């Protein structure tokens, strides 16, 4: 879990229970892929990680830039980027991660 970081940035990440939207930090490791998230500062101990090596990565049409990916164990997170290039670019990166 420590290799070289991939991409990182901010993206609005879905609760699972209430379905609230909030901001977290997210980098993108590879061997094995990851996606670890964080406080907005990066400063904390990560919130959680998602393993992402055979996931599925997918745009959602609209709330807007949404994307989701599912685990190979069937996990899901619901994501929103800010803008549509960082959403294109975030799907590019973890769809290449995930092979
Ligand atoms: O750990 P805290 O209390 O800050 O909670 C997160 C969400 O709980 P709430 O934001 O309090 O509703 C949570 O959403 P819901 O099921 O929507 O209540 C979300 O599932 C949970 O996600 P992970 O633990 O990362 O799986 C908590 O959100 P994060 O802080 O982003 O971890």
Redesign the pocket.
């Known amino acids: 879990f420590t290799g070289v970081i991939i991409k990182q940035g901010c993206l609005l ?1 879905q ?6 939207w ?1 901001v ?1 930090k997210f980098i993108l490791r590879e061997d094995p892929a990851y996606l670890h ?1 964080y406080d907005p500062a990066g400063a904390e101990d990560p ?2 990680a998602i393993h992402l090596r055979g996931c599925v990565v997918t745009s959602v049409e609209s709330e807007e830039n949404l994307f989701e990916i599912i685990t190979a164990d069937e996990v899901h997170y619901f994501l929103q980027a800010a803008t549509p290039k960082e959403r294109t670019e975030w799907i590019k990166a973890i769809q290449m991660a995930s092979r």
């Open positions: 990440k609760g699972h229970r209430r379905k609230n909030k977290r998230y919130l959680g």
